[PDB]
Amino acid sequence: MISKDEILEIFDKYNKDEITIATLGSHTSLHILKGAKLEGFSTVCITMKGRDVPYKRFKVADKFIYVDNFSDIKNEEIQEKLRELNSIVVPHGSFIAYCGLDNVENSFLVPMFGNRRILRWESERSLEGKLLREAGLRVPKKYESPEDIDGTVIVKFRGYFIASSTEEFYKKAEDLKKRGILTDEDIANAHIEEYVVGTNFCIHYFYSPLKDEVELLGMDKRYESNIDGLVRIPAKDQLEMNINPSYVITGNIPVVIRESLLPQVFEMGDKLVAKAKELVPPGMIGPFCLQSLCNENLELVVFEMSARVDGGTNSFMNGGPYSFLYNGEPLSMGQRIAREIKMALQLDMIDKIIS
């Protein structure tokens, strides 16, 4: 429901000499907050007892807003403190979850960097797939039912698994059932897709509304448990084990793509951005991620996407190979975001970047 005009009129009651930057103490905040500081902003970190330390030892947050549980960040109490601090909020991962995405779309009355509406088109696999499909991006083939399985597939609902046949599907579905990890409910709605075999590049872009431009900021590959520990076990020993792959994100590892694939990489960000404009105006605002896999035909296949800032950006908080190129600075995505805010304020174009 949340209107833009409704948000622009909250921002107007804002002391424009004292715009702070706020976000939740988790996910990507360290460099969101550090990046604000580096751009001259004072930073507000929503945190809680037990989860505050890293924001305290990294000296990255000027003001803390402590909650009892991160769940409370939907409360009017917290929204008020945030408005009283003239904070623009930088959403992420974790913020959407603890706040709840409905609360974010119509209950969270705090100005927010980026296109609010577009946060749903990422929460929903149908919307996400629509966008990537309509944008004209390579996605893994979808499979309506386990009977369609005609190659290796991955099956999504931690409870992930791999299958090369309909038979293998239920064999495994059953396994994860008789072990409590999967309920017949999840198994019914199971999303089955082509298992793309290749190299992982989670590619972090920044669309600048001010500059009307898609920028490449960086790239990481996921570091997942247990899978990445599983495959570090020799095949002989893996076969002697009764173990299921899990794919819990635990970290990220820096990587750079082959330079001749940047034209492809940029086109992918352009296309996505150009279609998101039509489907969810104003479209992709600020940071977004294409989580892709490079098959052996040097084709990047997008198996997931983020419409906010993605966790992999943590791999370059001190800047990386790509973010450096612009101005030879240790530029993080957090800071890149802070700059857009800064510059928008300075050109009186805050309406191009908040919602």
Ligand X SMILES: NC(=O)c1ncn([C@@H]2O[C@H](COP(=O)(O)O)[C@@H](O)[C@H]2O)c1NC=O
Residue carrying structure tokens 């082509």: 194
- Give SS3 for 325: helix
Beta carbon nearer to ligand ADP, 194 or 215: 194
Q: Say if residues 334 and 34 touch (Cβ distance below 8 Å).
A: yes
Out of Cl ion, its own copies, ligand X, none, what residue 178 binds, judged by CB under 5 to 8 A for its kind, is: none
Query: Which segment (129-137, 272-280, 308-316, 324-332) binds ligand X by CB under 6 A?
Result: 308-316
Q: In DSSP terms, which residues pair with 289 in a beta bridge?
A: 204, 306
* Residue closest to ligand X when measured from CB atoms: 311
**Residue ranges of the binding site:** 27, 94, 156-160, 193-196, 224, 252, 291, 304
Here's the x/- map for Cl ion, 189-218, by CB under 5 A: it reads as ---------------x--------------
Alpha carbon of 163 to those of 27, 33, 119: distances in Å? 31, 42, 31
Beta carbon nearer to its own copies, 105 or 175: 175
CB of 203 to ligand X, least distance (A): 13
Query: Which segment (8-16, 42-50, 305-313, 343-351) binds Cl ion by CB under 5 A?
Result: 305-313
- Give SS3 for 267: helix
Beta carbon nearer to ligand ADP, 249 or 347: 249
Q: Which of 26, 86, 115, 244 binds ligand X (CB under 6 A)?
A: 26
Out of its own copies, ligand X, Cl ion, none, what residue 97 binds, judged by CB under 5 to 8 A for its kind, is: ligand X
CB of 207 to ligand ADP, least distance (A): 20
Q: Residue 227: count other Cβ atoms within 10 Å of its Cβ.
A: 17
* DSSP label at residue 140: P
Cis amide linkage into residue 327, ω under 30° from 0 = no
Does residue 94 touch ligand X according to CB under 6 A? yes
Does residue 31 touch Cl ion according to CB under 5 A? no
Beta carbon nearer to its own copies, 89 or 155: 155
Q: Say if residues 122 and 284 touch (Cβ distance below 8 Å).
A: no
CB of 298 to ligand ADP, least distance (A): 14
Does residue 287 touch Cl ion according to CB under 5 A? yes
Q: In DSSP terms, which residues pair with 215 in a beta bridge?
A: 206
Q: Which of 312, 319, 320, 334 binds ligand X (CB under 6 A)?
A: 312
In 39-180, which residue ranges form alpha helices assigned H by DSSP?
53-57, 76-84, 93-99, 101-102, 120-123, 125-135, 166-177
Which residues lie below 8 Å from residue 124, measured CB to CB, with a gap of 6+? none
Q: In DSSP terms, which residues pair with 214 in a beta bridge?
A: 207
CA 249, 34, 83, 345 torsion-angle sign: negative
Q: Using CB under 6 A, which residues numbered 237 to 256 contact ligand X?
A: 249, 252
Beta carbon nearer to its own copies, 6 or 56: 56
Q: Which of 22, 48, 118, 154 binds ligand ADP (CB under 6 A)?
A: 154
Q: In DSSP terms, which residues pair with 300 in a beta bridge?
A: 294
**Residue ranges of the binding site for ATP:** 156-160, 193-196, 224
CA 82, 83, 89, 91 torsion-angle sign: positive
What is the total count of residues that contact ligand ADP (CB under 6 A)? 15
Out of its own copies, ligand X, Cl ion, none, what residue 287 binds, judged by CB under 5 to 8 A for its kind, is: Cl ion
Gap between the Cα atoms of 71 and 73, Å rounded = 6
| Residue 239 burial (10 A CB sphere; 0-12, 13-18, 19+) | exposed
Q: Which amino acid is at 352?
A: K
Query: Which segment (32-40, 47-55, 93-101, 324-332) binds ligand X by CB under 6 A?
Result: 93-101
Which chain residues interact with ligand ADP by CB under 6 A? 140, 154, 156, 193-196, 200, 222, 224, 247, 249, 293, 303-304
Which chain residues interact with ligand X by CB under 6 A? 26-27, 93-94, 97, 249, 252, 258, 260, 306, 310-312, 314
